[PDB]
Amino acid sequence: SIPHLILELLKCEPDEPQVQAKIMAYLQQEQANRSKHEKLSTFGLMCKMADQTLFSIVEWARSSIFFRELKVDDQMKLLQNCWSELLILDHIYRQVVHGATLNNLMSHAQELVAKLRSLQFDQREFVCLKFLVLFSLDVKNLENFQLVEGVQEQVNAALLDYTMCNYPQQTEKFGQLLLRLPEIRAISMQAEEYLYYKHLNGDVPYNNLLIEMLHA
């Protein structure tokens, strides 16, 4: 049983396996176009995967219900705020279904994954959390802040309805899921700090969307 609002959020979802296959295919071909003297490192490859996932995220948002009614400048502000949270949420959800600073980052990410696996985190819950992350009350200077308030109110209500109806045996699932959101924020800030450092050392592939977001 699914609130109609969640069904409509689901209709906005890309097929992520297809998205990730297309990215892998693109990167395999690029690496095969490169000479042995200019091959990408594993780290370079992982950054280009992130850049391309960001394109997919921007495409998802821009075509999404509600989001698409915002003026360009409001869309920019929302995405500038949550881009790295959306990357992290994408990574965590993928782990759920299927150095040193880096190590701390990985270990924290794995704690979140293990918690969400335990809860039996599903796709309907996932799309709700993606909208709550996208429509953030943290964002200043929006022209239509009201829309953020409405999305927050209604998606919270839909998520509560969904969890109560579909997972009644977990009487605190709604609250336990929301508690992960500040965790995602924290890990996303750790990941940006790490990437920013590598960037200052000129090791991140650049002239791309990933770098712009780090800077902005």
Binding site: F55, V58, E59, R62, V72, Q75, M76, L79, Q80, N208, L209, E212, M213, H215, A216
Partner: peptide
């Protein structure tokens, strides 16, 4: 700043 690529994607 403004992210040029992002702006171009959203403006299309």
């Amino acid at each position: 700043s403004r992210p040029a690529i992002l702006y171009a994607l959203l403006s299309s």
